[PDB]
Design a protein around this ligand. Structure first.
Ligand SMILES: Nc1ccn([C@@H]2O[C@H](COP(=O)(O)OP(=O)(O)OP(=O)(O)O)C[C@H]2O)c(=O)n1
Ligand SMILES: Nc1ccn([C@@H]2O[C@H](COP(=O)(O)OP(=O)(O)OP(=O)(O)O)C[C@H]2O)c(=O)n1
Ligand SMILES: Nc1ccn([C@@H]2O[C@H](COP(=O)(O)OP(=O)(O)OP(=O)(O)O)C[C@H]2O)c(=O)n1
Ligand SMILES: [Mn+2]
Ligand SMILES: [Mn+2]
Length: 1264
RNA sequence: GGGGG
RNA sequence: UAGCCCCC
């Protein structure tokens, strides 16, 4: 460690709280990181005096592996395939030798790539050559699922840990996290690699590059080493930063060693991934003596997902695990995969926890951080053949006799059907009618928003559409000469803009291109990039599904994103007396087929939508005639609406199936079109659709089936007390059945077990295999809960991991920084040990802050000052002679955050600056007599500040665009959007109205007329950048670094005029013995103190924020937050109502709605959060898990502590100031380490009035 | 672009 | 060729 100490000495102390941070030391540390050679990191690793406890037997078979050749074969269709041995799952990358297939690299003679000879033979068509190429390309792919070379993360860890234990400012003692000599993962990493390199001078087992992966030419290297090493590094970092129990961590290493010792690392990982969760989380408290859990009340209406904390629920034996024991299956699993030693140890330790508390949840969390974090990989061919093959077993089909004769592509489900489909059909029919009945549905704007949803910069099987169209002699415009990417639905929209639906209808049946996605702890999933006409025609399906979800059930719309996964719901559901069943449906997409679901859904919508859609087109789709054969004998023609025409065309596609075009670039010669009946993922209907069926069937079970299939009084009573509107929350195929508890305790476990078994049997009737789980735990949207405590899963957030489905190279340097910041933010949300995490993050950041640049032998270097990271959100450890660790990771981002940390030490800074020569006679309002301008330019604080705000990726705008084709394109886009003259007429009105009442007040008027331009830009910025555009990006960053400044942004200079007084610590908002988030306990002072004093966010963040906008949606391309900001700004700038009415007309509203919302906005008392947007202030993401609403309202006093001040008084017409002022106070409170404190407005330099004018100038100048 | 179903 | 839905 002397190697590390010498090279990063001063920097190490700067990030350990011992010495101040300085850009000079930081940049040198950066240069040192870049000058360190890979092999040096290993040499550094050798310098570590590892303890015996950090060692464990390493399997010799991890090095000696068979040839890959017996693991593959050519199938009947000539595709290269993986040959199974351990089951139908054994389709991943096998653990084999690989050096025999490599050619030494010219220069790195010890490293090699796949023999060019072998690929050439493979390309010629040689079976053996193809097999070898496939293996080589997929093994390479497996090794690319990381963000950057492992050595960088390791070096970072060495540098960070060289600082020793950290002194907690709050607890006033050093932490007791074992040093690296006790880190088993690192030891293994060094040994495994050393053993591989053997006598070779090169210590790296492989090199992650841009030109591709290269393997160390050693007979001991295996295709399984990259994944193994990647798991070890994560575990190594986590043991030091999450303060994980070392003994547990070793268990995680053993599993990984076993995975590398097996015949397939990924496969083995997939089969054993439940070990830690099953033997801890799902086995906790078989016995229970005490502890406390939350006591929440679910407010009304439950749909708001709003809860209120009511105290603590004392625990006792009464609440011990009552759910069935998983011991047997868990042990069988361990025995089957050679891990019974691990399962047994976990089972034993889990039993020792008889109290539910911080210690016990941290144990679970720790255990669950040890699961491999690799993104499983297998060839595309394998994913497609495993996911689009299995078909649902409909044990009780809809009788053929129950369908009427056809009505085009659909058949009505006779109302005399005794089938359970009866209910599924009624729900979709009902919702279809109500949806189509809504007036908004027939508003040109609404239909523009819908037509604009799928017009995006992402793909849409562009090539297949062009050819399915060529098949009927219809050639689309090619716009020869435009600098935009052609494979975008945006390009598609422009091509189709001026063609009648009848000419593009065939495209609805065009093939579907391949799209893949790798996941952690899961298998790769195939994706279907539907084309514009396919997405268009899917509208009715999507809208009806949305209507069901918004009006008929209890569901959360989104994908996930911590807190957006409604944390509050899990706390409630998992807290005794309450209990929850974690319902999930396997093979969801493959279970939604025409045989039972789609034929019914298509029918119900087609019919229920009839009367209100009659005699009318929809979203560009015309009405038409179709053959009618409903009645027997009677055969006529039937007029249907455009909406019906859509269902008509969509039904034709759902019936036939999807032609998936598979071009497997990892498997030479594996080109085939696979037909499948599995439901599309890339469809706008997918998510909402599955959510709707989920609740609909659960409703039917609880209302009909269940009751009719049992006479058991308790079960009948239990089911009767459950409602899909009050007790069942779902999204897609995930479900959470919440059984509220009584004073008599919780509902009988045996009665619950009966209900579940019936649900299970119930789904077999229509092809659904319910994955039900009753284990005393709550699991929803990959969020884990036990006894009201959230258990972060560190396993799913691989520090070094990064999904990479395609072969394309990683984005140019700059890009990596956003990823590193994301790694930091995940740690904040996962609750790692704040100091250890912050210090490590500074090391990591520093190690990626420098890049070598080229301009033609013009070898320079791009360096980001430490200050850029602060701007991005990374808190300072110690600066300007301040105490160490005074800054919390809840410090805001950007200007708000800069304001916060600077205000907390304004005086320290001023004093430091003067005592170091930065003095002047001019007395600064913020920094007194400190020559701040000279200081900030020299320290690179201004530089870093501005560099952080520059594009971290090449720009394509400015590419020579031949004006004529450029106008044709944007015209096509315009016609697509402005199809309906009514809409256009609306915007033109807003326009001339704007010139009279709004023009001049603000300069950011959002307008539908901009969309075509924003769409063009999007298609542009989607294309591959050139090396020139790259240089241009660097030059920009480098010019900002050279330039010298005299101030911060106009908004930051304005906030700095405001001063506060931090006062009394707040009282606890929740009980301090209450486990809310594992890892967030008295051992993690700042996070814990913030959680306790500020309080947890007990409402859904989606619901909360939906109340901070006047309009929820708008045409894709415009920014809802932008529209909201313009309206409020106009109001704040004294604009007349007619001006807001004009703004609203320009974004598509009818004059009546426009005038109404405008008049409504004028007289409204706007909330803190919504109002703060007038100046671009947003609630920080890191704050989302806390009760920031309460902080703004009751703990940021705008009235000075000692009464009113002339400067602090808020002018009559400037009440909007209070919202901005609330954010600034909150900033300082949240940025200060420790307990949330009450803060009092102390001063505003030039007074409130002048502050307001200052903000009003910023407002009216945006976009000039 | 980032983090997540 | 590389989809859809969400927090900044
Ligand atoms: N990028 C993504 C990720 C997920 N999904 C959707 O999420 C839904 C279900 O999620 P999973 O549980 O992850 O998919 P399953 O096929 O059901 O996996 P298996 O039963 O193992 O869980 C269906 C799928 O289309 C999606 O459209 N796009
Ligand atoms: N002032 C410097 C010089 C080099 N590098 C880093 O070095 C790496 C590759 O170049 P080297 O071959 O390692 O640089 P050398 O200067 O030739 O090595 P040193 O003096 O020991 O010889 C990439 C580049 O960013 C750097 O960050 N800053
Ligand atoms: N913004 C960037 C990114 C990369 N390059 C050029 O790309 C070439 C090699 O790519 P890298 O592998 O990304 O650069 P290295 O210095 O070899 O190391 P890495 O980015 O970790 O620093 C050399 C470098 O000048 C550049 O000029 N400007
Ligand atoms: Mn599922
Ligand atoms: Mn699921």
């Amino acid at each position: 460690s002397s190697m590390i100490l010498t090279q990063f000495g001063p920097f190490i102390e700067s990030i350990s709280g011992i010495t101040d941070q300085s850009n000079d030391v930081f940049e040198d540390a950066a240069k040192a990181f870049s000058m360190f050679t890979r092999s040096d990191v290993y040499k550094a690793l050798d310098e570590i005096p590892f303890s015996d406890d950090a060692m464990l037997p390493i399997p010799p078979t991890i090095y000696t592996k068979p040839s890959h050749d017996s693991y593959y074969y050519i199938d009947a269709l000539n595709r290269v395939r993986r040959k199974t041995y351990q089951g139908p799952d054994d389709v991943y990358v096998p653990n084999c030798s690989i050096v025999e297939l490599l050619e030494p690299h010219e220069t790195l003679t010890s490293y090699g790539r796949l023999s060019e000879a072998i690929e050439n033979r493979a390309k010629d068509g040689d079976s053996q050559a193809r097999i070898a190429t496939t293996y080589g390309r997929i093994a390479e792919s497996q090794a690319r699922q990381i963000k950057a070379p492992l050595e960088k993360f390791v070096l970072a860890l060495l540098v960070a840990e060289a600082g020793g234990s950290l002194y907690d400012p709050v607890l006033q003692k050093y932490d007791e996290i074992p040093d690296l000599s006790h880190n088993c993962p690192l030891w293994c990493f060094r040994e495994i690699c050393r053993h591989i390199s053997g006598p070779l001078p090169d210590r790296a087992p492989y090199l992650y590059l841009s030109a591709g992966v290269f393997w160390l030419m050693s007979p001991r290297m295996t295709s399984a080493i990259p994944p193994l090493l990647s798991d070890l590094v994560n575990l190594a970092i986590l043991q030091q930063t999450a303060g994980l129990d070392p003994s547990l961590v070793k268990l995680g290493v053993q599993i990984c060693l076993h995975a590398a010792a097996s015949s397939s690392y990924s496969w083995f990982i997939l089969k054993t991934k439940s070990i830690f969760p099953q033997n801890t989380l799902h086995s906790m408290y078989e016995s229970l003596e005490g502890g406390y859990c939350p006591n929440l009340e679910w407010l009304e209406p439950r749909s708001d997902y709003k809860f209120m904390y009511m105290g603590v629920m004392p625990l006792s034996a009464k609440y011990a695990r009552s759910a069935p024991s998983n011991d047997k299956k868990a042990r069988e699993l361990g025995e089957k995969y050679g891990l019974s030693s691990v399962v047994g140890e976990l089972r034993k330790r889990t039993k020792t926890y008889v109290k539910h508390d911080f210690a016990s949840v941290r144990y679970i969390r720790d255990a669950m951080a040890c699961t491999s974090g690799i993104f499983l990989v297998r060839t595309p061919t394998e994913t497609v053949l495993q996911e689009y093959t299995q078909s649902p077993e409909i044990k009780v089909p809809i009788p053929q006799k129950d369908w009427t004769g056809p009505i085009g592509e659909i058949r009505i489900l006779k109302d005399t059907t005794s089938s359970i489909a009866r209910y599924l059909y009624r729900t979709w029919y009902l919702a279809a009618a109500r949806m189509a009945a809504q007036p908004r549905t027939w508003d040109p704007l609404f239909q523009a928003i819908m037509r604009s949803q799928y017009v995006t910069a992402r793909g849409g099987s562009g090539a297949a559409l062009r050819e399915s169209l060529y098949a009927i002699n219809v050639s689309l415009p090619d716009f020869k000469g435009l600098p935009v990417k052609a494979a975008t639905k945006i390009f598609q929209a422009a091509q189709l803009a001026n063609l009648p639906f009848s000419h593009t209808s065939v495209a609805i049946l065009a093939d579907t291109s391949m799209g893949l996605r790798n996941q952690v702890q899961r298998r790769p999933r195939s994706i279907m990039p539907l084309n514009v006409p396919q997405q268009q025609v899917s509208a009715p399906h999507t809208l009806t599904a949305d209507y069901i979800n918004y009006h008929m059930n209890l569901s959360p719309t989104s994908g996930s994103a911590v807190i957006e996964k409604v944390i509050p719901l899990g706390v409630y559901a998992s807290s005794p007396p309450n209990q929850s069943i974690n319902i999930d449906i396997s093979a969801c997409d493959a279970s939604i087929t025409w045989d039972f679901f789609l034929s019914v859904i298509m029918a119900a919508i087609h019919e229920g939508v009839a009367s209100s859609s009659i005699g009318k087109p929809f979203m560009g789709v015309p009405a038409s005639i179709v053959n009618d054969e409903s009645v027997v004998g009677v055969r006529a023609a039937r007029p249907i609406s455009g909406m019906q025409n859509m269902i008509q065309h969509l039904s034709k596609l759902y019936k036939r199936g999807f032609s998936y075009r598979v071009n497997d670039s990892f498997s030479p010669g594996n080109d085939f079109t696979h037909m499948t009946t599995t439901f599309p993922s890339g469809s706008t209907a997918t998510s909402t659709e599955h959510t709707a069926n989920n609740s609909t069937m659960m409703e039917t079970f609880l209302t009909v089936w269940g009751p009719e299939h049992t006479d058991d009084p308790d079960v009948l009573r239990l089911m009767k007390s459950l409602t899909i509107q009050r007790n069942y929350v779902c999204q897609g195929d995930d479900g959470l059945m919440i059984i509220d508890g009584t004073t008599a305790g919780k509902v009988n476990s045996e009665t619950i077990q009966n209900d579940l078994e019936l649900i299970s049997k119930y789904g077999e009737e229509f092809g659904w295999k319910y994955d039900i789980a009753y284990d005393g735990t709550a699991e929803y949207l990959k969020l884990y809960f036990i006894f009201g405590c959230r258990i972060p899963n560190l396993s799913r957030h691989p520090i070094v991991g990064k999904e990479r489905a395609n072969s394309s190279a990683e984005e140019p340097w700059p890009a990596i920084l956003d990823q590193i910041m994301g790694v930091f933010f995940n740690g904040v949300h996962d609750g790692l040990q704040w100091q250890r995490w912050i210090r490590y993050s500074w090391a990591l950041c520093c190690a990626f802050s420098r890049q070598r640049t080229m301009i033609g032998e013009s070898v320079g270097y791009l360096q980001y000052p430490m200050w850029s990271f602060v701007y991005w959100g990374l808190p300072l450890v110690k600066a300007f002679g301040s105490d160490p660790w005074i800054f919390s990771w809840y410090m805001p981002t950007g200007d708000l955050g800069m304001y916060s940390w600077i205000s907390l030490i304004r005086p320290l800074m001023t004093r430091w600056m003067v005592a170091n020569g930065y003095v002047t006679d001019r007395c600064s309002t913020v920094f007194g007599n400190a020559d701040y301008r000279r200081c900030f330019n020299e320290l690179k604080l201004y530089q870093g500040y501005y560099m952080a705000q520059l594009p971290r990726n090449p720009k394509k705008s400015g590419r020579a665009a031949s004006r004529e084709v450029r106008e044709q394109f944007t015209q096509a886009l315009s016609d697509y959007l402005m199809q309906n003259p009514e809409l256009k007429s609306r915007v033109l009105r807003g326009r001339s109205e704007w010139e009279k009442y709004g023009a001049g007040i603000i300069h950011n008027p959002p307008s539908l007329f901009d969309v075509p331009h924003k769409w063009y830009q999007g298609a542009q910025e989607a294309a591959i950048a050139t090396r020139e555009e790259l240089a241009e990006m660097d030059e920009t960053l480098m010019r900002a670094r050279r330039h010298s400044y005299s101030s911060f942004s106009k908004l930051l200079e304005a906030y700095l005029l405001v001063k506060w007084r931090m006062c009394e610590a707040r009282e606890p908002s929740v009980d301090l013995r209450l486990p809310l988030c594992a890892g967030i306990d008295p051992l993690n002072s700042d996070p814990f103190l913030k959680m306790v004093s500020v309080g947890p966010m007990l409402q859904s963040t989606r619901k909360y924020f939906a109340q901070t906008l006047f309009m929820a949606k708008t045409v894709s391309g415009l920014d809802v937050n932008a529209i909201d900001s313009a309206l409020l700004r106009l109001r704040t700038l004294g604009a007349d109502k007619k001006a807001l009415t004009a703004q609203l007309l320009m974004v598509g509203l009818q004059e009546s709605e426009a005038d109404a919302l405008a008049g409504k906005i004028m007289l409204q008392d706007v909330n803190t959060v919504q109002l703060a947007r007038v100046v671009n202030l947003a609630v920080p993401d890191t704050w989302m898990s806390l009760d920031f609403d309460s902080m703004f309202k009751h703990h940021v006093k705008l009235l000075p502590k000692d009464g009113r001040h002339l400067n602090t008084d808020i002018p009559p017409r400037m009440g909007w100031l209070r919202a901005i002022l609330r954010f600034l106070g909150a900033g300082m409170v949240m940025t200060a380490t420790g307990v949330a404190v009450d803060i009092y407005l102390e001063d505003i330099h030039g007074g409130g009035r002048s502050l307001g004018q200052r903000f009003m100038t910023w407002m009216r100048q945006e976009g000039r």
